[PDB]
Design a protein around this ligand. Structure first.
Ligand SMILES: *[C@@H]1O[C@H](CO)[C@@H](O[C@@H]2O[C@H](CO)[C@@H](O[C@@H]3O[C@H](CO)[C@@H](O)[C@H](O[C@H]4O[C@H](CO)[C@@H](O)[C@H](O)[C@@H]4O)[C@@H]3O)[C@H](O)[C@H]2NC(C)=O)[C@H](O)[C@H]1NC(C)=O
Ligand SMILES: *[C@@H]1O[C@H](CO)[C@@H](O[C@@H]2O[C@H](CO)[C@@H](O[C@@H]3O[C@H](CO)[C@@H](O)[C@H](O[C@H]4O[C@H](CO)[C@@H](O)[C@H](O)[C@@H]4O)[C@@H]3O)[C@H](O)[C@H]2NC(C)=O)[C@H](O)[C@H]1NC(C)=O
Ligand SMILES: *[C@@H]1O[C@H](CO)[C@@H](O[C@@H]2O[C@H](CO)[C@@H](O[C@@H]3O[C@H](CO)[C@@H](O)[C@H](O[C@H]4O[C@H](CO)[C@@H](O)[C@H](O)[C@@H]4O)[C@@H]3O)[C@H](O)[C@H]2NC(C)=O)[C@H](O)[C@H]1NC(C)=O
Ligand SMILES: *[C@@H]1O[C@H](CO)[C@@H](O[C@@H]2O[C@H](CO)[C@@H](O[C@@H]3O[C@H](CO)[C@@H](O)[C@H](O[C@H]4O[C@H](CO)[C@@H](O)[C@H](O)[C@@H]4O)[C@@H]3O)[C@H](O)[C@H]2NC(C)=O)[C@H](O)[C@H]1NC(C)=O
Ligand SMILES: *[C@@H]1O[C@H](CO)[C@@H](O[C@@H]2O[C@H](CO)[C@@H](O[C@@H]3O[C@H](CO)[C@@H](O)[C@H](O[C@H]4O[C@H](CO)[C@@H](O)[C@H](O)[C@@H]4O)[C@@H]3O)[C@H](O)[C@H]2NC(C)=O)[C@H](O)[C@H]1NC(C)=O
Ligand SMILES: *[C@@H]1O[C@H](CO[C@@H]2O[C@@H](C)[C@@H](O)[C@@H](O)[C@@H]2O)[C@@H](O[C@@H]2O[C@H](CO)[C@@H](O[C@@H]3O[C@H](CO)[C@@H](O)[C@H](O)[C@@H]3O)[C@H](O)[C@H]2NC(C)=O)[C@H](O)[C@H]1NC(C)=O
Ligand SMILES: *[C@@H]1O[C@H](CO)[C@@H](O[C@@H]2O[C@H](CO)[C@@H](O[C@@H]3O[C@H](CO)[C@@H](O)[C@H](O)[C@@H]3O)[C@H](O)[C@H]2NC(C)=O)[C@H](O)[C@H]1NC(C)=O
Ligand SMILES: *[C@@H]1O[C@H](CO)[C@@H](O[C@@H]2O[C@H](CO)[C@@H](O[C@@H]3O[C@H](CO)[C@@H](O)[C@H](O)[C@@H]3O)[C@H](O)[C@H]2NC(C)=O)[C@H](O)[C@H]1NC(C)=O
Ligand SMILES: *[C@@H]1O[C@H](CO)[C@@H](O[C@@H]2O[C@H](CO)[C@@H](O[C@@H]3O[C@H](CO)[C@@H](O)[C@H](O)[C@@H]3O)[C@H](O)[C@H]2NC(C)=O)[C@H](O)[C@H]1NC(C)=O
Ligand SMILES: *[C@@H]1O[C@H](CO)[C@@H](O[C@@H]2O[C@H](CO)[C@@H](O)[C@H](O)[C@H]2NC(C)=O)[C@H](O)[C@H]1NC(C)=O
Ligand SMILES: *[C@@H]1O[C@H](CO)[C@@H](O[C@@H]2O[C@H](CO)[C@@H](O)[C@H](O)[C@H]2NC(C)=O)[C@H](O)[C@H]1NC(C)=O
Ligand SMILES: *[C@@H]1O[C@H](CO)[C@@H](O[C@@H]2O[C@H](CO)[C@@H](O)[C@H](O)[C@H]2NC(C)=O)[C@H](O)[C@H]1NC(C)=O
Ligand SMILES: *[C@@H]1O[C@H](CO)[C@@H](O[C@@H]2O[C@H](CO)[C@@H](O)[C@H](O)[C@H]2NC(C)=O)[C@H](O)[C@H]1NC(C)=O
Ligand SMILES: *[C@@H]1O[C@H](CO)[C@@H](O[C@@H]2O[C@H](CO)[C@@H](O)[C@H](O)[C@H]2NC(C)=O)[C@H](O)[C@H]1NC(C)=O
Ligand SMILES: *[C@@H]1O[C@H](CO)[C@@H](O[C@@H]2O[C@H](CO)[C@@H](O)[C@H](O)[C@H]2NC(C)=O)[C@H](O)[C@H]1NC(C)=O
Ligand SMILES: *[C@@H]1O[C@H](CO)[C@@H](O[C@@H]2O[C@H](CO)[C@@H](O)[C@H](O)[C@H]2NC(C)=O)[C@H](O)[C@H]1NC(C)=O
Ligand SMILES: *[C@@H]1O[C@H](CO)[C@@H](O)[C@H](O)[C@H]1NC(C)=O
Ligand SMILES: *[C@@H]1O[C@H](CO)[C@@H](O)[C@H](O)[C@H]1NC(C)=O
Lengths: 187, 214, 218, 161, 187, 161, 161
């Protein structure tokens, strides 16, 4: 029961929840719902559902920047996601809505391998690192040919609750895409 | 040389109040070398705050460090009976190498109390030796600021008496003073009436207790 | 456990020397710097001297410059402080505390040893003289006077230690002759005077003096 | 670049150096400390996941302490210090391990040897995981042996010193 | 006086002025004036004054690139500054002027915490690393809530003089923002 | 990435290796050299500010020498070599130290031990500064002791070799 | 960042660790192996070109093996793993060497010592080149001597162990 007769095997599990004030924390609730928490009262909701929340195909980012009503912290992590997405040439799937600071971005995944939905799902697995394999089938099986059964990726802002159900929070997710930023993007 | 000014030199509060202890330096010093200490007269001083902000191990969470430039502050959120003691700020690097503050006194704020004055003539067993002693007792008063004057035949005497103050009581939270007037047996017989004049903040008029020799 | 073992107190005449020691317990002694700190009677905190780890640089306060010599034996894990040619103002309680001044961590004195009583006075050991302090005609006050004794301290109780309520043993003060003196008083009801016997039990641990003075009103 | 954050939790300890984890930094556990002999490997090795978390927690401890709280939890600070605190390729390595169905480190569970009497502890190495299940203790028993033997060799040198 | 009785403490101070041909050097003159030197005859002047030098609110960069009249070395360090500025959504404070290669950029700082003036001041402290705390109050006090009494940041080109008055020149400043480039910027 | 610039100033010396600083590289000082025993720690340690300056000056020395002068002092070269010369997080660490009111290194003043007879020198560590004032010599005396003791242990090994 | 790819070719060997190069990884050559004593320097040293190629080939071996082939040879994977496999400044250093007419490493030819009887091999250091011509063997003979002497010192320690 003891290694080398003099040593004991002991373990420790880090409480990532205390890093909320300094860095964002990523955790997943179930198959559809995934979350990024920024602070103790603010968060962001990543969800995968077959139901569309934005019918129009526009993305008035320039207007949203002028009427500065959003949270800069949440605008940073949503910019980090899209900048981390490689090979983004189909701007038709890019549908955004920022009415009065209420941020919400939708990606049309319904469109074979290497599609525009591939790079979005790859970025999603890194964003919610703790427990993202539940959203895909044979997640370790592939990397380039990454695909899910759902058709839309909706990212809305939300209030803070104990949503970390399937996995514990972790900054390992967000901190990874900071280097992949503005890479593999075309002119 | 660097001069550390601690303000105030006397502080009155009650358990549960916010204590804001200040520390002024003569030179724009480094925040990284400021430290705070709690001194109990019975034992060695304990390190509370080091590096102006960091809390040492065993120091409760109510203590906090703050300050920059020349104004540094030790703040206690809610007080407790153990927190009522002396406190010292320090800085390492200037002259002298370890500078120390004056001394911030933290005492319990009792309702104002009047001193019970008593005067004691020199015992005849003591006058047989050749020296007399006149004791003037001030018992259970608040605050500590009290003034005792000695009038010999309605004439003030200065420098020939010694005062002594006890610490604040554990239950009633009051102080006590005992000014002892020492005179020679030849000079004690040179006079007749002796009195001590007690002037306290909790006194409408200065009380004077006297006695006639013989 | 992390401690500092103090030792070296005593009484000396002005001009004589005295050695202070401080042993290390449960920590790498050669890794930290050692400092000496004193507190004069009724005064604030003071810095005496300091010696770095490895004993390369030594510093002193302008007061004890020349009279004091700080040294350390990193092999024995012990700190020392020699006090040649002591003076009157050098009487105080002395402490030994460790510090670490580095880029990695701030300045602090976390580990401290207990107090070291140092008395530098030309007076000699003398027993106390207990003189009563009685009142004269609903509560009165009577006490004792412990005058002319050396050195400190002296313990005083009342009625074989039974009477405790209302007792005030005042802090001792040092007279011009160099001899300590204090007064221990107690508040008693006026109806018990001449009826309840009041005695103060003074004990002077130096010279082993045990005086029991009967305080009765005049 | 290369990480440069240096942690210091030497106050009130037997020897300078070493780091302690408060009971609020560990889930369902009291506080645990590790000797300076162990944390010294954090300044050298460029591939220990537990060392990257130590620099991340010591930053979170110092950032909250020495910088007044922002208005609405600003992320500007951590984005510029991330490369000096952790290793961007250490997490990228665990991605590829997870991507290739190889047991990876999800930065949550850590294991370490701790002597039954003298209390000497090793540097906590990361407990791996694959398809959302930690490896059994027997999966890497020879890794513990190589790590438990390092304890004996490291113990020998102190007497030799 | 000697450490371990056999060793002496000796010091050396690097002469950063000799690195001028290879890399730019940053030094500050006083509270208002700060400088970046590129070579021995060319420089750039960072200044903080309450007086505005550009009234219009335009920034014809595309025209300036076509009529290539500026110095590419100075255009690199001015692009490095703006790219290092995080959370730049208020393009109204962006006022530029490049008449015939004479480069000059102004930032409207007169506009609470996390404003558009915050990220500009943060980038300024790194740009003139040697002696930038003089321009702000309690510089070490904060990072996110960074603020000065002035209202405009003017960056004009200038000739080379011995402007390094308060601090010595140093490339440590400019070389630091090269990694922060194109990060924390929104779409 | 990780720095990779290797400096070579071994010509006309007693032993191969080691670097010298000309009197034009130091303000108000003559030329100073450092042994190969000391500069060898520059190829290993990822956290020494003085080593990053050595690679920066040896680059400035070689760039002016082996590349014809540009028309108007081009900055294209240094921008691409900065990551191979210095450490982008070593300077970022000193930012955070300055940001947190902690004594930082502003890369100007350096201190080092130099034996009074045998002339052996240590690697110059950076003299820190806070609120625009260098630390007094007594602020980090125990750091010198740990560094002066390293000289004795390093001296012992040569005889043991 | 800092490279983090760990290679493992220990199956069916005398000792755990070490890497082998198949005859398809080398041009006009059969398969060659290198001991764990040598490849251990790849986990430490941040400046060996041959170690960066080992991590690049062990990645190519594992990527083709453990990930189903993409539709049209996707480059998305290698772009994100390049910083965890090699050193971006090690290649940047050889650019500057080539830029300054200094013999650089074009990552093709490597040399190593191999004992004539006991078969102990050194870590293959890169064969340099300038103006498209490899250096003659005599150009760096003293480098081989310093490397051949390292073999004797490394051989001595095993007996001392
Ligand atoms: C986001 O991060 C912040 C900071 O990292 C974090 O704030 C901290 O939360 C903890 C726990 O809520 C606080 O700790 C408490 O401190 C007080 C004294 O200040 C103690 O008395 C408390 O102890 C009681 O409760 C414990 C259970 O939590 C019991 O085990 C114990 O026996 C006591 O009964 C407790 O330790 C800490 O003070 C704050 N930090 C500050 C600066 O106030 C915050 O919780 C994180 N967000 C989330 C959602 O977790
Ligand atoms: C690294 O990988 C491991 C293994 O894959 C992973 O561990 C698992 O974490 C989850 C999430 O915490 C654990 O699930 C718990 O199960 C218990 C018992 O059913 C629940 O009570 C827990 O619920 C809490 O959270 C709910 C929502 O926040 C609350 O409503 C509820 O009241 C509880 O507070 C929780 O669902 C699971 O047991 C472990 N598995 C193991 C083997 O430990 C770990 O999370 C991964 N690391 C990261 C950073 O994701
Ligand atoms: C920008 O960088 C460049 C290169 O890094 C730098 O150029 C160099 O300047 C120095 C000093 O001005 C030059 O050094 C001189 O060299 C001559 C021989 O070539 C010597 O005779 C000189 O010595 C006299 O002057 C010294 C004082 O400087 C005295 O101490 C000495 O006793 C002599 O009287 C002097 O050393 C050097 O030659 C150039 N480099 C080249 C390639 O010419 C330039 O100065 C930097 N810019 C600024 C503004 O400093
Ligand atoms: C790192 O921090 C240190 C300390 O904060 C910092 O050091 C200081 O540098 C300044 C700038 O060189 C020094 O100031 C000098 O003071 C003398 C005496 O008054 C002046 O004569 C100097 O003036 C020169 O420059 C003027 C304008 O260029 C000329 O007109 C004049 O004729 C002189 O040539 C200069 O103002 C100051 O003394 C030091 N302080 C210390 C303690 O050494 C250092 O600069 C910082 N490092 C960097 C890279 O910024
Ligand atoms: C690193 O530098 C070295 C030296 O500069 C460099 O080596 C040279 O590589 C070339 C290219 O392989 C070699 O040239 C060969 O010459 C033979 C004999 O003439 C030819 O038969 C070869 O031709 C082949 O390829 C043709 C087109 O693909 C085919 O049509 C033909 O049938 C052959 O298959 C080839 O041209 C040259 O000999 C070496 N030189 C030395 C000294 O080894 C090396 O390539 C550089 N590394 C990299 C990665 O570029
Ligand atoms: C660092 O140390 C200096 C003193 O310098 C030191 O002096 C010796 C003790 C040796 O250790 C030397 O090696 C070392 O250089 C501190 O500077 C001092 O500042 C104080 C306050 O600003 C000065 O006090 C004043 O003195 C004048 C008379 O000279 C009085 O009129 C004033 O009222 C005031 O008392 C002190 O003189 C000065 N010392 C010197 C030598 O100039 C410095 O504060 C300290 N810390 C820092 C951050 O620099
Ligand atoms: C490695 O194992 C040893 C024992 O096998 C662990 O030591 C024990 O740790 C606990 C908790 O840290 C200590 O408990 C504490 O006791 C003190 C009184 O001594 C009490 O005041 C505290 O509140 C707490 O209850 C315990 O004393 C200690 N035992 C010994 C012999 O040291 C050690 O913690 C293990 N190491 C790690 C990293 O987990
Ligand atoms: C460490 O300290 C030693 C002495 O304590 C320093 O050595 C001395 O350094 C100076 C300047 O480098 C030497 O001066 C030179 O002398 C030669 C003639 O020998 C002359 O031609 C030169 O022009 C110059 O004046 C001096 O000789 C030397 N002394 C000895 C005994 O070596 C040493 O430089 C210090 N190290 C560092 C890094 O500063
Ligand atoms: C270092 O030099 C030694 C000899 O000087 C090399 O050893 C020889 O290597 C060859 C090819 O790897 C071995 O050949 C093989 O022989 C086996 C039968 O033993 C056969 O089944 C294979 O098909 C192959 O032909 C040869 O046995 C071996 N000799 C010895 C004594 O070990 C060694 O390869 C050199 N190292 C390197 C890295 O090149
Ligand atoms: C994952 O959990 C969320 C939250 O519990 C589920 O969302 C809810 O779905 C029901 C049914 O459509 C709604 O009535 C609730 O309003 C939803 N709540 C929120 C917060 O969105 C979600 O359905 C779960 N998904 C799966 C696959 O189990
Ligand atoms: C984003 O902003 C633009 C500009 O205001 C909007 O464009 C207008 O579109 C309507 C309908 O096509 C036209 O009638 C207007 O003339 C357009 N305005 C301009 C200035 O060209 C656009 O509709 C906005 N999109 C969303 C989703 O809000
Ligand atoms: C996303 O953020 C917006 C803005 O902060 C939130 O909007 C608020 O919504 C509540 C409830 O509908 C209103 O009472 C507030 O007046 C709104 N504030 C503003 C500024 O518009 C929105 O609720 C957030 N999203 C979610 C899911 O909570
Ligand atoms: C900082 O120094 C500069 C240069 O010495 C000062 O600028 C001068 O200001 C005066 C008064 O307005 C003008 O007459 C000069 O023409 C200016 N010279 C230059 C080169 O701009 C500046 O005022 C100083 N600032 C402070 C706060 O002292
Ligand atoms: C800055 O440095 C350059 C290069 O050393 C100096 O350039 C020289 O200029 C003179 C006059 O135009 C020419 O005769 C020389 O041929 C130039 N040098 C070279 C190497 O071509 C320039 O004068 C310096 N400027 C200042 C103000 O010192
Ligand atoms: C930047 O360039 C544009 C394009 O030349 C200028 O725009 C002109 O603006 C005036 C006044 O509003 C109009 O009358 C012209 O028709 C515009 N030209 C075009 C082609 O649209 C703009 O004024 C320039 N800005 C600055 C500051 O120079
Ligand atoms: C900024 O750069 C411009 C262009 O190099 C400088 O403009 C020159 O200014 C002088 C004096 O006004 C004229 O004699 C030249 O003819 C101008 N050259 C050009 C190409 O326009 C301008 O002086 C620089 N700024 C400062 C403050 O010196
Ligand atoms: C993980 O295990 C589940 C359980 O059956 C299985 O359905 C899934 O395919 C597995 N995924 C991988 C990547 O092995
Ligand atoms: C630096 O010292 C000056 C001198 O008084 C002071 O005004 C300023 O607030 C200090 N700044 C910091 C960051 O400590």
């Amino acid at each position: 029961s003891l290694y080398k007769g003099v040593y004991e095997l002991q373990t420790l599990e880090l409480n990532m929840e205390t890093l909320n004030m300094t860095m964002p924390l990523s955790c997943t609730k179930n198959n559809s719902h995934h979350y990024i928490m920024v602070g103790n009262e603010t968060g962001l909701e990543l969800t995968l559902t077959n139901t569309s929340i934005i019918n129009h195909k526009f993305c008035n980012l320039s207007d949203a920047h002028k009427k500065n009503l959003y949270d800069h912290a949440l605008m940073s992590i949503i910019s980090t996601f899209h900048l981390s997405i490689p090979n983004f040439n189909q701007y038709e799937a890019m549908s955004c809505d920022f009415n009065g600071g209420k941020i919400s971005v939708q990606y049309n995944l319904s469109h074979h391998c290497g599609t525009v939905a591939n790079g979005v799902l790859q970025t999603f697995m890194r964003m919610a690192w703790g427990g993202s394999y539940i959203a895909l089938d044979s997640g370790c099986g592939n990397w380039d040919c990454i695909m899910t059964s759902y058709q839309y990726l909706i990212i809305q802002n939300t209030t803070w609750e104990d949503h970390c159900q399937f996995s514990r929070p972790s900054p390992i997710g967000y901190l990874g895409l900071l280097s992949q930023r503005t890479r593999d993007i075309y002119i | 040389d660097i001069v550390l000014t601690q303000s105030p030199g006397t502080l009155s509060l009650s358990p549960g109040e916010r204590a804001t202890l200040s520390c002024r330096a003569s030179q724009s010093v480094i925040s990284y070398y400021v430290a705070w200490y709690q001194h109990k007269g019975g034992q060695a001083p304990r390190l509370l705050i080091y590096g102006a902000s960091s809390r040492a191990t065993g120091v409760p969470d109510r203590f906090s460090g703050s300050g920059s430039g020349t104004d540094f502050t030790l703040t206690i959120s809610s007080l407790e009976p153990e927190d009522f003691a002396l406190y010292y700020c320090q800085y390492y690097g200037s002259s002298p190498l370890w500078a120390f503050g004056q001394g911030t006194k933290v005492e319990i704020k009792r309702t104002v109390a009047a001193p019970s004055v008593f005067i004691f003539p020199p015992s005849d067993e003591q006058l047989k030796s050749g020296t007399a002693s006149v004791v003037c007792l001030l018992n259970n008063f608040y605050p500590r600021e009290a003034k005792v004057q000695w009038k010999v035949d309605n004439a003030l005497q200065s420098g020939n008496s010694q005062e002594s103050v006890t610490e604040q009581d554990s239950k009633d939270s009051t102080y006590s003073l005992s000014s002892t007037l020492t005179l020679s047996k030849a000079d004690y017989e040179k006079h007749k009436v002796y009195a001590c004049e007690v002037t306290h903040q909790g006194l409408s008029s200065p009380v004077t207790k006297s006695f006639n020799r013989g | 456990e992390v401690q500092l073992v103090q030792s070296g107190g005593g009484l000396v005449r002005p001009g004589g020397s005295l050695r202070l020691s401080c042993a290390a317990a449960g920590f790498t002694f050669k890794s930290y710097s050692m400092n000496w700190v004193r507190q004069a009677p009724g005064r604030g905190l003071e810095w005496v001297s300091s010696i770095t780890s490895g004993g390369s640089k030594t510093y002193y306060a302008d007061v004890v410059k020349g009279r004091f010599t700080v040294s350390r034996d990193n092999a024995k894990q012990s700190l020392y402080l020699q006090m040649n040619s002591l003076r009157a103002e050098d009487t105080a309680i002395y402490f030994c505390a460790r510090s670490l001044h580095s880029t990695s961590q701030p300045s602090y004195m976390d580990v401290w040893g207990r107090k070291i009583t140092v008395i530098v006075s030309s007076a000699s050991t003398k027993g106390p003289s207990v003189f009563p302090l009685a009142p004269s005609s609903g509560t009165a006050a009577l006490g004792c006077l412990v005058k002319d004794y050396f050195p400190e301290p002296v313990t005083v109780s009342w009625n074989s230690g039974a009477l405790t309520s209302g007792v005030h043993t005042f802090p001792a003060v040092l007279q011009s002759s160099g001899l300590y003196s204090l007064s221990s008083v107690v508040t008693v009801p006026s109806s018990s005077l001449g009826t309840q016997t009041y005695i103060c039990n003074v004990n002077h641990k130096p010279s082993n003096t045990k005086v029991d003075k009967r305080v009765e009103p005049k | 670049g290369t990480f440069t954050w240096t942690l210091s939790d030497s106050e009130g300890k037997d020897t300078p150096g070493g780091y302690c984890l408060t009971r609020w930094m560990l889930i369902e556990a009291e506080l645990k400390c590790f000797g300076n002999t162990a944390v010294a490997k954090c300044n050298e090795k460029h591939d220990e996941e537990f060392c990257d978390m130590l620099r991340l927690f010591d930053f979170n401890k110092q950032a909250i302490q020495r910088l007044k709280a922002p208005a609405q939890t600003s992320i500007q600070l951590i984005n510029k210090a991330v490369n000096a605190l952790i290793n961007d390729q250490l997490i990228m390595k665990n991605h590829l391990r997870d991507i290739m169905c190889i047991p990876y480190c999800n930065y949550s569970k850590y294991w370490y040897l701790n002597h039954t009497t003298t209390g000497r502890t090793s540097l906590p190495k990361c407990w791996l995981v694959s398809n959302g299940s930690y490896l059994n203790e027997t999966h890497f028993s020879d890794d513990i042996e190589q790590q438990a033997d390092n304890m004996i060799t490291e113990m020998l040198q102190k007497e030799y010193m």
